[PDB]
Amino acid sequence: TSIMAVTFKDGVILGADSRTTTGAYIANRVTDKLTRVHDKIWCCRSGSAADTQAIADIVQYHLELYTSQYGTPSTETAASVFKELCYENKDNLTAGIIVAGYDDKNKGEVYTIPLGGSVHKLPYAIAGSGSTFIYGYCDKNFRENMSKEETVDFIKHSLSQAIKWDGSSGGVIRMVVLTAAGVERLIFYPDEYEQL
Amino acid sequence: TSIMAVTFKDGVILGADSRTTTGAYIANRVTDKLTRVHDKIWCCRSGSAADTQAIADIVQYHLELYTSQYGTPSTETAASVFKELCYENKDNLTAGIIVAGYDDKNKGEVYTIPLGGSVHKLPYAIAGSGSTFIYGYCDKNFRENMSKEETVDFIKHSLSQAIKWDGSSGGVIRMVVLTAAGVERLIFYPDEYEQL
Amino acid sequence: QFNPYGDNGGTILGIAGEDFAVLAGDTRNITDYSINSRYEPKVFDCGDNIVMSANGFAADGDALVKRFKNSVKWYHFDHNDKKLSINSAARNIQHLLYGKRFFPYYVHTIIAGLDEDGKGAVYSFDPVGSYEREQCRAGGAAASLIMPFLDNQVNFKNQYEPGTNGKVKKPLKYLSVEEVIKLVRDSFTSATERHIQVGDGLEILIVTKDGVRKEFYELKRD
Amino acid sequence: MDIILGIRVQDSVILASSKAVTRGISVLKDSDDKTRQLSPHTLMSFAGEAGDTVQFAEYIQANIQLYSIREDYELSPQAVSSFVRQELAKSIRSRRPYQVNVLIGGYDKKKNKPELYQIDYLGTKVELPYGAHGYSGFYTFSLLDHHYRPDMTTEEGLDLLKLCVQELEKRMPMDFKGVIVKIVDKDGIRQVDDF
Amino acid sequence: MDIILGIRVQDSVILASSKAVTRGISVLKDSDDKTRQLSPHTLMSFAGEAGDTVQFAEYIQANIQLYSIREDYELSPQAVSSFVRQELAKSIRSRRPYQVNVLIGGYDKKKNKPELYQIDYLGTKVELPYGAHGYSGFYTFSLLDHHYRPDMTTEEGLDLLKLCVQELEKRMPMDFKGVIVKIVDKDGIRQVDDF
Amino acid sequence: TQQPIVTGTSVISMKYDNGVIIAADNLGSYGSLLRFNGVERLIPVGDNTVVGISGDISDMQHIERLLKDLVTENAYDNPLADAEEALEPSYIFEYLATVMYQRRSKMNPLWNAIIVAGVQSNGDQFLRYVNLLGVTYSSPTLATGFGAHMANPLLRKVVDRESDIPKTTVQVAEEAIVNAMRVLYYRDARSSRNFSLAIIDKNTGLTFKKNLQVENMKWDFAKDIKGYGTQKI
Amino acid sequence: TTIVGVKFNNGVVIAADTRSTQGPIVADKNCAKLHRISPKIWCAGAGTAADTEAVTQLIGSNIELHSLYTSREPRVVSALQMLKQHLFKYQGHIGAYLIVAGVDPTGSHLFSIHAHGSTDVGYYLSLGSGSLAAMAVLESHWKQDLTKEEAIKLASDAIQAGIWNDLGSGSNVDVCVMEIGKDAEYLRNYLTPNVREEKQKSYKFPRGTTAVLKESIVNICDIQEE
Amino acid sequence: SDPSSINGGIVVAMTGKDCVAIACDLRLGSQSLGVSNKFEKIFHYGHVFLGITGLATDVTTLNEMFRYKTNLYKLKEERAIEPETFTQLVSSSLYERRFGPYFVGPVVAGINSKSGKPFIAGFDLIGCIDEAKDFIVSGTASDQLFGMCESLYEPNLEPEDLFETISQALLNAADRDALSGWGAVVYIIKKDEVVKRYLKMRQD
Amino acid sequence: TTTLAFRFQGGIIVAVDSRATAGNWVASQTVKKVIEINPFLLGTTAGGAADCQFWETWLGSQCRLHELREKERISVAAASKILSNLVYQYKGAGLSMGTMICGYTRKEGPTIYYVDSDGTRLKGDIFCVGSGQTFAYGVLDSNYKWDLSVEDALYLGKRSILAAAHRDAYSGGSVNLYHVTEDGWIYHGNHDVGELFWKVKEEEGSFNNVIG
Ligand SMILES: *[B]([O])([O])[C]([C][C]([C])[C])[N]C(=O)[C]([C]C1=[C][C]=[C][C]=[C]1)[N]C(=O)C1=[C]N=[C][C]=N1
Ligand SMILES: *[B]([O])([O])[C]([C][C]([C])[C])[N]C(=O)[C]([C]C1=[C][C]=[C][C]=[C]1)[N]C(=O)C1=[C]N=[C][C]=N1
Ligand SMILES: *[B]([O])([O])[C]([C][C]([C])[C])[N]C(=O)[C]([C]C1=[C][C]=[C][C]=[C]1)[N]C(=O)C1=[C]N=[C][C]=N1
Numbered sequence A, B: 001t002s003i004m005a006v007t008f009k010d011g012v013i014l015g016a017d018s019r020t021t022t023g024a025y026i027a028n029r030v031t032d033k034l035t036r037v038h039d040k041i042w043c044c045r046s047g048s049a050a051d052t053q054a055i056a057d058i059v060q061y062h063l064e065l066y067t068s069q070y071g072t073p074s075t076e077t078a079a080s081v082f083k084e085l086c087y088e089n090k091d092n093l094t095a096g097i098i099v100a101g102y103d104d105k106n107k108g109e110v111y112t113i114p115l116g117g118s119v120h121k122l123p124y125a126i127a128g129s130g131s132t133f134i135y136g137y138c139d140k141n142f143r144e145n146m147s148k149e150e151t152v153d154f155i156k157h158s159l160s161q162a163i164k165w166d167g168s169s170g171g172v173i174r175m176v177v178l179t180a181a182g183v184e185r186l187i188f189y190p191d192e193y194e195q196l
Numbered sequence C: 001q002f003n004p005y006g007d008n009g010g011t012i013l014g015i016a017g018e019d020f021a022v023l024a025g026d027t028r029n030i031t032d033y034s035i036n037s038r039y040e041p042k043v044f045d046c047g048d049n050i051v052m053s054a055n056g057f058a059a060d061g062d063a064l065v066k067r068f069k070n071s072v073k074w075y076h077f078d079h080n081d082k083k084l085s086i087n088s089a090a091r092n093i094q095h096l097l098y099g100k101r102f103f104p105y106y107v108h109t110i111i112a113g114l115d116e117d118g119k120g121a122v123y124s125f126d127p128v129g130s131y132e133r134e135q136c137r138a139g140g141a142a143a144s145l146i147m148p149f150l151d152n153q154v155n156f157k158n159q160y161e162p163g164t165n166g167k168v169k170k171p172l173k174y175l176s177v178e179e180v181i182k183l184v185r186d187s188f189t190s191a192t193e194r195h196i197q198v199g200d201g202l203e204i205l206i207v208t209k210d211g212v213r214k215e216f217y218e219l220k221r222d
Numbered sequence D, E: 001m002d003i004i005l006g007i008r009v010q011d012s013v014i015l016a017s018s019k020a021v022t023r024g025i026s027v028l029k030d031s032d033d034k035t036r037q038l039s040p041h042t043l044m045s046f047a048g049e050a051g052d053t054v055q056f057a058e059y060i061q062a063n064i065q066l067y068s069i070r071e072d073y074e075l076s077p078q079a080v081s082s083f084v085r086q087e088l089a090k091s092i093r094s095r096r097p098y099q100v101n102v103l104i105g106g107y108d109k110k111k112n113k114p115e116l117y118q119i120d121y122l123g124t125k126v127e128l129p130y131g132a133h134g135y136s137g138f139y140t141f142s143l144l145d146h147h148y149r150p151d152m153t154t155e156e157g158l159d160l161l162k163l164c165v166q167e168l169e170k171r172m173p174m175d176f177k178g179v180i181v182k183i184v185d186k187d188g189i190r191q192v193d194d195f
Numbered sequence F: 001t002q003q004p005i006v007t008g009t010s011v012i013s014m015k016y017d018n019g020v021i022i023a024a025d026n027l028g029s030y031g032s033l034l035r036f037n038g039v040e041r042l043i044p045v046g047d048n049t050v051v052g053i054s055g056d057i058s059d060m061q062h063i064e065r066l067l068k069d070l071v072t073e074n075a076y077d078n079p080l081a082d083a084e085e086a087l088e089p090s091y092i093f094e095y096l097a098t099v100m101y102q103r104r105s106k107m108n109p110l111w112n113a114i115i116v117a118g119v120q121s122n123g124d125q126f127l128r129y130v131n132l133l134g135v136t137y138s139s140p141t142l143a144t145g146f147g148a149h150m151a152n153p154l155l156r157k158v159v160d161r162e163s164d165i166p167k168t169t170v171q172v173a174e175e176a177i178v179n180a181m182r183v184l185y186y187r188d189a190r191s192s193r194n195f196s197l198a199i200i201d202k203n204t205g206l207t208f209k210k211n212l213q214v215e216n217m218k219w220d221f222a223k224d225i226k227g228y229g230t231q232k233i
Numbered sequence G: 001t002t003i004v005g006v007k008f009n010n011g012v013v014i015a016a017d018t019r020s021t022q023g024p025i026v027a028d029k030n031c032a033k034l035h036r037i038s039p040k041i042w043c044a045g046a047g048t049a050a051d052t053e054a055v056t057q058l059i060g061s062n063i064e065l066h067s068l069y070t071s072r073e074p075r076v077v078s079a080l081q082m083l084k085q086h087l088f089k090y091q092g093h094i095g096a097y098l099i100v101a102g103v104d105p106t107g108s109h110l111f112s113i114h115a116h117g118s119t120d121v122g123y124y125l126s127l128g129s130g131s132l133a134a135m136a137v138l139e140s141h142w143k144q145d146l147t148k149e150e151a152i153k154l155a156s157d158a159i160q161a162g163i164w165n166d167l168g169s170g171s172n173v174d175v176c177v178m179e180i181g182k183d184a185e186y187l188r189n190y191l192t193p194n195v196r197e198e199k200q201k202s203y204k205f206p207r208g209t210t211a212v213l214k215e216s217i218v219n220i221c222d223i224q225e226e
Numbered sequence H: 001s002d003p004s005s006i007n008g009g010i011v012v013a014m015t016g017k018d019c020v021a022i023a024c025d026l027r028l029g030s031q032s033l034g035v036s037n038k039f040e041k042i043f044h045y046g047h048v049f050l051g052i053t054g055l056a057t058d059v060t061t062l063n064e065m066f067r068y069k070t071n072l073y074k075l076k077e078e079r080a081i082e083p084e085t086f087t088q089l090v091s092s093s094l095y096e097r098r099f100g101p102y103f104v105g106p107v108v109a110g111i112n113s114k115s116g117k118p119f120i121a122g123f124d125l126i127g128c129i130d131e132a133k134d135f136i137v138s139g140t141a142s143d144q145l146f147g148m149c150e151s152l153y154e155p156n157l158e159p160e161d162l163f164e165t166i167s168q169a170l171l172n173a174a175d176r177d178a179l180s181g182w183g184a185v186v187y188i189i190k191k192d193e194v195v196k197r198y199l200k201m202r203q204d
Numbered sequence I: 001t002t003t004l005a006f007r008f009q010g011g012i013i014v015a016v017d018s019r020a021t022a023g024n025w026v027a028s029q030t031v032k033k034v035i036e037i038n039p040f041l042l043g044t045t046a047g048g049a050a051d052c053q054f055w056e057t058w059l060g061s062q063c064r065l066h067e068l069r070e071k072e073r074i075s076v077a078a079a080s081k082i083l084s085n086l087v088y089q090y091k092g093a094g095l096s097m098g099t100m101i102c103g104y105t106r107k108e109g110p111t112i113y114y115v116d117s118d119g120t121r122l123k124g125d126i127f128c129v130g131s132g133q134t135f136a137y138g139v140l141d142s143n144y145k146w147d148l149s150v151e152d153a154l155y156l157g158k159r160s161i162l163a164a165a166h167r168d169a170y171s172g173g174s175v176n177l178y179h180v181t182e183d184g185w186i187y188h189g190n191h192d193v194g195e196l197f198w199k200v201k202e203e204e205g206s207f208n209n210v211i212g
């Protein structure tokens, strides 16, 4: 799995590959790892598919109930609910989740939650098995306050390399753009990103 | 360990960090992993220090005896002697070796020999624990027929990132330049390469 | 796998006199081959003229002492400020230790004081609460070094009277507080020489009818 | 414990049980009675893990005695054996199962028939003309297969039992220190004091 | 095998060895002689793992008999015991060690003294007034510590030996089927046919 | 029972004449991967205490929340919350020590080693250690992990016993701490160049220094080192 | 064990503590960990005591025969090569961790050797359980162009750090200085900062205190004449 | 299972003024079972004394081995072996079995016949030499012996005083060890006379 | 540990050793392995020190509560069964106990029950329990009779412990003797083995193997 979330001038963009594997067999080549827990709060999922789905479903429930009582939750609040589930059930879970959201007050934010259930607020985050192969690339190429087009290219180039080297990553590159304008879904096929 | 060898227009350059570790303790912070098996045939060593030294010492002996009888050996021949030792003793060895040399006829050549004892002739090669973090970077930034200055910058930037992310890599960046002109040793200190 | 136990080293020593009692212990605290502290008190005044030390795994040791001090406090509340006798304290400690029979306090406990007749008393415990009143006891890491010396020099074991040749034993004459402190200091100096977990400092608590007094001596720091 | 045998003849049931109790390398006792009277016409012998055997036997004894007082009536051997089996079948899926094998020898006063039931610690019940638990049956069943006739007398049953014990004393490695023999018939339960 | 005992009295050495051979749950034999005559005035009893015992004993026997023919002379019990010990000490660091414990009872014709040597499979030799291998000593040494005197006669030695065997027959769990007793003195080796 | 995932390395500390110093680097390691480079592992409690934590970072963040909640709870119905009834280092430590020992006793430890550094009401220096086993001890110098093996020897040359504390100034103490942090960067494979340092003085109060770097490093001699024995070039 | 090696202007110095342990017990308080391979090639040993002694004696013996065969003074690189190849062959089972130093016609040298056969080159080195304490001192106080006096001071201080802070090290500091164009000086017990204090009491017993059963003269002499 | 504590036993050696002393217990057992109370662990080759603790079969084997070697030494050298030289021979012989060792704890004691200097030495099972000035300890009660020796010992003791010190060190150490005791022997060694004393001790 | 108890004409003899060990280390030579439950009940301790001593001390509390409630001393059968039922609840948890419950009542006479941590409860005339039990059995079985004098029975018990103290490495220290009669138990002193061995050797002529 190769997943990442990147903050930029207008907000934040989530990115992911589409490969699910049972050992070396690709059980799903068109998986959607970018999942919605609220209107403009999404997450990237890595690790166990069952665990991350169960977690995401519970978080979506919590934020829906939060909204009914207290209005729209912050991205930090969403990250905290993820953390609470991941931390308290650390012995029984295998979940590496990146939480990304857009407020009007706070703008684009990214929180990464690795295996232990710790929380880390970052300008951008990478995770999954394939992320190992792009630490060098991403660190050298990331800039703060990029444009939408630059951020899309950054994620496209990064995940392209992660896919190239990681057997557990592959398929299409899915992306979700979170800004004041709304929510935009992007997809990029092998013929496009392999020749980069 | 972060090691690499890169062919370029005038020949080939070997590069390495200087860290030797026993678990998390740094047993040697100024290690020389670039070792000479012949005048213009060198190797980068990764894995067990004892194994790679023993192997390198045996290869140097073989090539010295080869030279006395048949004249200067090719880089391919040197790689074959490494392979023979690594392959036949695969059960008892932990050695990841990159062989690099300069002929006048063949110019700069690089052969990588991973754990199994297979041989792979490549334009450039990366190896060691820290190499994982720069597959993305190196693949995107490598070009064939680079200049000496460009190749030095490529290795310096690559190993800088490998050092940054890999705990088993660190210290100074050592480099050895192999051309028709001769053999040049280069060293780069933390204050220089960390700010890159 | 998580190991809930550890070994903090150290060594303790209790000797009962005729109208006094001493409880000594080194002040070194360790894990593996490192020193945590050169001065970490191990022998404690628990009130009612009773001194206590629980040597071995320091976390369990501190927990036990803390719980016994608590037991003394509640003994006063529940029984009209009655003085907890050394024999009653010893039985109480057995129940504290045996209460965790299936997840033991990993310590060797020794208490010292005066019995109800005013005579010197030392009680010694195993980790799960078996206890016994003794005239002499060393505990902890260097216990195997010190106890034989005390069998010889406190109870005059294997000693006989000259001229008789094995027929008449050496009489069991009583030892003064000055004489006991000499044996304690030599015991710990000898233990420090041959045991790596023993050293830094020696702290002795002396119990008499007048109260609890303290003495400190330097030990080798290597 | 070690050896317990049972044989149902014409008009009675005979139970034979070893007297030895061994822990480790020592025979602590050589006169142990490995049986309990459950009711006037029902006897149960037992063998298995130390402690469990007596605890189980006395527990069963108490329950049958309670039933007897409540109803002023003796349960049939079949009814007692079914109760015992259920307790063992319940036990085998417990936190710590009763590690006990039993023989139940009883005389049914209603049908005027002797009855022998063999039940193991799993709750495996079988009614038999002759039975055994442990390594005893490996020797005794061949002899009983040859000699046993269903219309034998009590005296003939005891002679056939002596032949079983003699074989065990010859071929078994463990010295079980002889057996206590008890007879269950219409008149109740009695012990053969010379065997 | 199981029990082997030895006692050195005034003018002789007495070895007692069990007759049982057990494999699994069956006593295959009850008249087995667990000993070999090494020389006219030297007897060796043995116990340990099946096969190894006899193989080792007969191997030693052959070597001592070879020495006797070559030199036309009988080795002293001390010399034989030292030879046996070296073989076992050699054996313990072999690919597959001899798993055999032995007692060597001999009468030294030069010194006119009986001698008893206890040697285990590791090659641990000790000269003793009385000895045993296995669990036998756990019972018999206390009795021998009490009764044994160094000037006992052969008849007194046999009575003290009967007291040892009686205790073993009372307290040991295994039925070892009695013992074969042999006496070693100045006149040679003889078997006590009634014991 | 668990295993630590994201981890922090050494925390080092010492006493000096008027207070205590404590320091720890800003790294959150993920095994051999030096994953997170901006982790603060010194957490102040009030203006008189700093808790330095090593080991599992998820458990560190939990402990950070407990301390934050402890301050909130202490202020409840407490008119002297910012004066006589403020939280002391000794109170904060004993609380943590209770939690650590309770958690180890349930076979579910907080996988950490903790040093509580501070100054008490009466001006006395407070410095005490506690870890995942509930083991506690105090010393003029305290260090966790690799610091125990490499920092303590250096810091003990400055303050070898109790009587050396009044003779040690804040400048000498800070110098020793900063040098120790350099040595750890040379020799600890799970350390970073960036670190935080905190001074708690009885006169000048709490001074919290962020974004410090290891400097004045010796690497020049590396150029002369060639081969592993016989090699000359 | 704490062993160190420090290069200086005109040579090299090695040092070691003197404690040997079996578990938590001190087997020897004044152990000699500095071994002579040849007159001007010495090495300090850590790990298994019999192994460091044996491997040094063997290589030292062969070095002597080699010196006689070639009519040349032995070189440190020869000792290094022979030690590493021997240790490599035994795959770390020979538990010898060595700091090899010396002077020869090529110059002054300092190397380390680990049990599996890997070698390292350096200006300052430390091995053993107290190597972290010693290396902390070396990393704090070492500089280029040290004098003989400064190198001895630095080396002994590094050992002291091991003596005081490592429970696996203790007692005394042994030193050997190997300067170019000079005899190597072996300073046995260079420092002695751990003398035991006077005991409070004398435990000399009165004669006849022990019970005896038998007495006899033991014949140690040969078979006599006449 | 542990070869060094199957049979049990102890040896201790001490130096005095122009004298040395070596002592041992007499027990040989099979774990809990006491077998023999006459198993002496001290041997001598000429004027050099050797005590050996540990696995009893190896104790016997090594005695026979060193008798073998010291006898050949004497025939070729035309003189008795000295303690310093014998110590090296023990070390050499033990190390040749590096990866298949004798499970023993040898102790050498004696006086050099030429210099008159008292000498003691101890070894581990694979040959490492511990050449102490004061005392050497070995066996299942080595912890106990260390404690006794380290407190009771003082330098330059006269032969008859040294006897008392070493005897009390052995006896009180043995009484705190289950696998040691059952009698004891003490050798007092001077340049040209050696006295052997059996000690009366508790027999449990 | 070696403990024994046997019924005879003059009631019951109880004899125990005094040694406690942790591996090969002798932890104590002065352990009280007989527990005075009441003036008529004795308990012996073998196995785990704490287990035996905690639960037999506890047994005395249960026996005292019985006679307060029932206005009558507890039977040896009932006292032994309280302990056996208790340890049976703990079966599998790892208690290590081998005990004799010895006493006299009017209805029972002199009675001995062997109770152990596996749940075994046995009434009998003779029992030896502990690591040195086999050694004690040797002396006891060869010399036992019903018609023994109090004096001779006491010596036999003392001598049997001595035998085991000699041969068993994990037994020794000293011998504690008790004599239980119709009118309660009677202590008969602590006997150090270090002095008792040589005394018995000389007077009895036994232990000719050993030199003295
Ligand atoms: B990715 O590889 O982490 C991916 C993300 C997931 C949310 C779709 N996980 C998987 O494919 C996992 C296995 C795995 C591979 C690599 C690292 C960690 C985990 N697969 C499954 O969970 C799975 C596979 N087949 C059926 C059902 N679930
Ligand atoms: B590098 O990390 O691979 C490095 C290269 C070596 C040739 C100097 N290897 C080591 O540091 C190895 C351990 C190791 C770490 C990471 C991957 C593989 C292996 N260390 C040693 O061989 C070593 C350490 N201490 C003493 C001796 N040898
Ligand atoms: B040091 O701690 O490395 C030291 C140096 C040695 C050369 C004198 N080593 C030892 O003290 C070793 C430790 C050790 C114990 C057990 C196995 C391997 C290593 N001790 C011994 O070699 C030793 C112990 N007891 C007697 C003799 N030798």
Ligand SMILES: *[B]([O])([O])[C]([C][C]([C])[C])[N]C(=O)[C]([C]C1=[C][C]=[C][C]=[C]1)[N]C(=O)C1=[C]N=[C][C]=N1
Pocket: C126, C130, I001, I002, I019, I020, I021, I022, I027, I031, I033, I045, I046, I047, I048, I049, I050, I052, I130, I131, I170, I171
């Ligand atoms: B006895 O050997 O059973 C003895 C009786 C007990 C009441 C002191 N037990 C022990 O010595 C046990 C160990 C043991 C040895 C042999 C057989 C069974 C058990 N020791 C302890 O209970 C103990 C108590 N405190 C300190 C050390 N050991």
Ligand SMILES: [Cl-]
Pocket: A031, A032, A033, A049, A053
């Ligand atoms: Cl999914």
Ligand SMILES: [Cl-]
Pocket: B031, B032, B033, B049, B053, F228, G119
């Ligand atoms: Cl290397």
Ligand SMILES: [Mg+2]
Pocket: B162, B163, B164, B165, B166, B167, B168, B169, B170
């Ligand atoms: Mg790095």
Ligand SMILES: [Mg+2]
Pocket: C191, C192, C193, C194, C195, C196, C197, C198, C199, C222
């Ligand atoms: Mg010490």
Ligand SMILES: [Mg+2]
Pocket: E118, E119, E120, E124, E125, E126, H035
């Ligand atoms: Mg034997």
Ligand SMILES: [Mg+2]
Pocket: H174, H175, H176, H177, H178, H179, H180, H181, H182, H204
């Ligand atoms: Mg003893």
Ligand SMILES: [Mg+2]
Pocket: H203, H204, I164, I165, I166, I167, I168, I169, I170, I171, I172
């Ligand atoms: Mg004994």
